[PDB]
Design a binder for this molecule. Structure first.
Ligand SMILES: [Zn+2]
Ligand SMILES: [Zn+2]
Lengths: 421, 155, 145, 48
């Protein structure tokens, strides 16, 4: 009752303490800025620095433990609901391991070969129908061998473990679970070493969701972005190829040549120096150069590299500002088309904000009533609530449609004043 | 109840003599109505759906409108509580179907993570999607949503 | 009251001139183009400051003696084993630095730590140049749009 | 501009087949008639 009670509690009290883990991370960063070099902690008039320090550090690790417990309570069943639904319908409509046998991509999928052996399989799609239905439909024509291919403190080693082992392997495929679990391990490494303990703060990247839109505006185009910057680095690489092979003695970090002249006849550290300055030069690759004494090579190197710093300033900047501001514009595009199509076409409607303003305030009511988005959902509840005997022939009819998943009960969106008017 | 003023006093006393008149004269709220009134609530709900689809089928009937509006507090009560949907279920006109919404299921819907994942799903569909897998994946989202409300109900 | 404080002190008296921000209304469109998205803008810049904060967290904990304002070390070496004034100096040198956080560095002698610090901080000045600029120009020009 | 090109591409593909050139309008009054309309009615490579 302790365990199940706290399961129900971390169910009902989860995002509050998620915001508290946020706030405790803030309290970490407020104080993790008073170090002094053997390393120790400075003292000011709040005479509880080190005690409450250690307390709230291990306590924030405890909060991470709390949120991973509450997350195991959280949408993990919806995860496996999606998963078991997916697998059971790709047995139902498909029968993938029967005959179809998918490829080596998504052993997320092929992982689920042996869970069909586990007779406890379609728990979290409530659909124990699917096993014997596939056995009847698909299994009979391909045989009883295929039926055998798919059929075949105290309580610790006496249950369907491989079902649960499979389940945990599915659990490890998650991204948000891996995210929060890696966050938890950061909290653990703070108990081992409370100096990378303050490195938790990448969780605010999935924290307040505007910041997540910022990071998405980074990352949704970020394939092109990162591959582009790699291409840019190759451009600078090849530039430093070009910016060596005549220009081999000139540019030196040295004290005029008394200290040994720092021009790089290594190719590699020439790249390193060049690249370094390019990404931290400011003026370009001309800052560290000799005075234009006026060799025929020297007109070449001056005009050469001032134009090539210029071309850096062209290419890498144009990458940065074009890619990012157009990413922001794309982020605009998404939500503006959202707010367009919400104000025009309900999903069950899909006609427009046109007929239902010829009915004045008929679009208001049309939205609220005619397609009333969650009420068709509530009817799906009502089907799941009622029984097919208890159903109407209309209810069982559309239920039979739902057995087909053929959707034709849903109209073109032409409503009751579209049939007559 | 007279401080509530909502009943005719004849019917207040009809409810009083109806209630218990017991143990001094005292009375319970639940045990007098609930076990019968909530079924009768479902009954008059069905009546409300009945007259509603009488109007919706057959409009513009001041006889029916009068008969409707005399019954009106029921209609106002069950106005969230009614289920109402439209389809074309092989009768090949445009076919509305009215039913029951468990309001407890809307308290389940009252969960805002449902709302946020819902608006997210709105964004998903308007973002992209085939128009024929549209309502398919919509219903799939609804199924996940139903199971989610089962989860939120058992807490 | 600013006009009153000029009668008390006619030196902050000239500080009236924020009224032209509600003066000619094109300037008000300029300030609105600032401020109508300015919720996202300001919260973003605070997030950016947290990014730089956490960067200076990262840009201390191996790199603790190197960078000095000192006169080669004769004057006492100005690398900050305080965490707070490291943030102050790091943030300042990432704000009014110019060429990132590489200007105030020991030239690469070539320690295994030193390849790390060079490539580290030139890419991290680079990532500053990514993030904070992209904030500025994207947010403002899209506000204009 | 590079955005403009491909977004008008993805517009006009989802509306008007080249042999069609009418829109995503008549063939949704036929529900999933635009799907089949694309795949069959102008079925680009089949005229080829
Ligand atoms: Zn419609
Ligand atoms: Zn055509």
């Amino acid at each position: 009752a302790y365990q199940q009670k706290l399961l129900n509690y971390f169910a009902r009290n989860f995002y509050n303490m998620r915001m508290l883990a946020l706030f405790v991370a803030f309290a970490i960063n407020f104080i993790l800025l008073f170090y002094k070099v053997v390393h120790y902690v400075l003292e000011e008039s709040s005479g509880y620095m080190e005690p409450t320090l250690r307390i709230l550090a291990i306590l924030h690790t405890v909060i991470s433990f709390f949120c991973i417990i509450g997350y195991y309570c959280l949408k993990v069943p919806l995860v496996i609901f999606k998963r078991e639904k997916e697998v059971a319908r790709k047995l139902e409509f498909d029968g993938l391991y029967i005959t179809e046998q998918p490829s080596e991509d998504d052993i997320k999928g092929q992982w689920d070969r042996l869970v069909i052996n586990t007779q406890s399989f379609p728990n979290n799609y409530w659909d124990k129908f699917v096993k014997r239905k596939v056995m009847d439909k698909y299994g009979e024509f391909y045989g009883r061998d295929r039926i055998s291919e798919l059929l075949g403190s105290a309580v610790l080693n006496s249950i369907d473990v491989k079902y649960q082992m499979w389940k945990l392997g599915v659990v490890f495929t998650d991204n948000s679970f891996l995210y929060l679990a890696w966050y938890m391990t950061m909290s653990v490494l703070g108990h081992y070493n409370n100096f990378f303990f303050a490195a938790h703060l990448l969780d605010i990247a999935m924290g307040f969701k505007t910041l997540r839109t910022i990071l998405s505006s980074v990352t949704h185009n970020g394939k092109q972005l990162v591959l582009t910057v790699g291409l840019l680095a190759v451009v600078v690489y090849l530039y430093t190829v070009v910016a060596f092979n005549f220009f081999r003695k000139f540019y030196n970090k040295s004290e005029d040549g008394d200290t040994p002249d720092m021009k790089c006849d290594d190719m590699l550290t020439c790249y390193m120096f060049h690249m370094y300055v390019g990404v931290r030069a400011g003026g370009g690759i001309g800052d560290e150069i000799e005075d234009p004494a006026g060799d025929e090579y020297e007109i070449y190197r001056i005009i050469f590299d001032i134009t090539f710093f210029f071309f850096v300033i062209v290419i890498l900047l144009a990458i940065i500002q074009g890619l990012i501001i157009d990413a922001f514009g794309e982020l605009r595009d998404q939500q503006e088309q959202v707010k367009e199509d919400m104000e025009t076409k309900c999903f069950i409607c899909g006609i427009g904000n046109d007929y239902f303003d010829t009915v004045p305030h008929g679009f208001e009511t049309h939205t609220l009533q005619e397609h009333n988005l969650a009420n068709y959902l509530f009817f799906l509840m009502y089907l799941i609530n009622k029984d097919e005997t208890e159903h109407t022939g209309q209810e069982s009819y559309v239920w039979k449609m739902y057995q087909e998943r053929c959707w034709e009960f849903f109209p073109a969106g032409d409503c009751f004043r579209k049939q007559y008017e | 109840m007279e401080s509530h003023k909502h009943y005719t006093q004849s019917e207040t006393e009809f409810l009083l003599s109806c209630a218990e008149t017991d143990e001094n004269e005292t009375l319970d709220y639940e045990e007098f109505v609930k076990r019968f009134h909530e079924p009768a609530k479902d009954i008059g709900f069905n009546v409300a759906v009945l007259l509603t689809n009488l109007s919706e089928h057959m409009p513009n009937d001041t006889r029916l409108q009068t008969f409707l509006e005399l019954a009106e507090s029921v209609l106002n009560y069950f106005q969230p509580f009614l289920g109402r949907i439209e389809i074309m279920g092989s009768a090949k006109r445009i076919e509305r179907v009215y039913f029951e919404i468990s309001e407890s299921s809307r308290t389940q819907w009252e969960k805002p993570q449902v709302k946020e994942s819902k608006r997210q799903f709105i964004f998903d569909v308007v973002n992209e999607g085939g128009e024929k897998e549209k309502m398919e994946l919509f219903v799939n989202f609804c199924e996940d949503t139903i199971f989610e409300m089962q989860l939120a109900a058992q807490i």
